[PDB]
Design a protein around this ligand. Structure first.
Ligand SMILES: [Cl-]
Ligand SMILES: [Cl-]
Ligand SMILES: [Cl-]
Length: 130
């Protein structure tokens, strides 16, 4: 599914994302916006290293989920990458929380550095009741 902006904001808030390991809701929104356009079903193959990015946060198969087909990979979220293509984003959120328990936190995603870091991201949550 493709979330509407404010629907997603509230959904993430219910799932405990607001301020998780220091990360505001507007940061998570900015990440989802630029990774996927708020789209849970998105996959992107990285021909360079044979990994794939999955779902609304575009979580990568080399480190985070198992797809069977990524050489040398591990699965720190202990999930099938299939779990990250559901309309229900609970598993994706749990896996995003796992990513940001590592030292880089939200910097793990390059798109966040590019599109969100050191910016005014308040627009992402404006009017959403969060
Ligand atoms: Cl911030
Ligand atoms: Cl699974
Ligand atoms: Cl679903």
């Amino acid at each position: 599914k493709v979330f509407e902006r404010c629907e997603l904001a509230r959904t993430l808030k219910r799932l405990g994302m607001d301020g998780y390991r220091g990360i505001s809701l507007a940061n998570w929104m900015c990440l989802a916006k630029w990774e996927s356009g708020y789209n849970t079903r998105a996959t992107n193959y990285n021909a360079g290293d044979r990994s794939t990015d999955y779902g609304i946060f575009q979580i990568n198969s080399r480190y985070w989920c198992n797809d069977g087909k990524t050489p040398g990979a591990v699965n720190a979220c202990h999930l099938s990458c299939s779990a990250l293509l559901q309309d229900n984003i609970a598993d994706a959120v749990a896996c995003a929380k796992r990513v940001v328990r590592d030292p880089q936190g939200i910097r793990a995603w390059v798109a966040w550095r590019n599109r969100c870091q050191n910016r005014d991201v308040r627009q992402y949550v404006q009017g959403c009741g969060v």
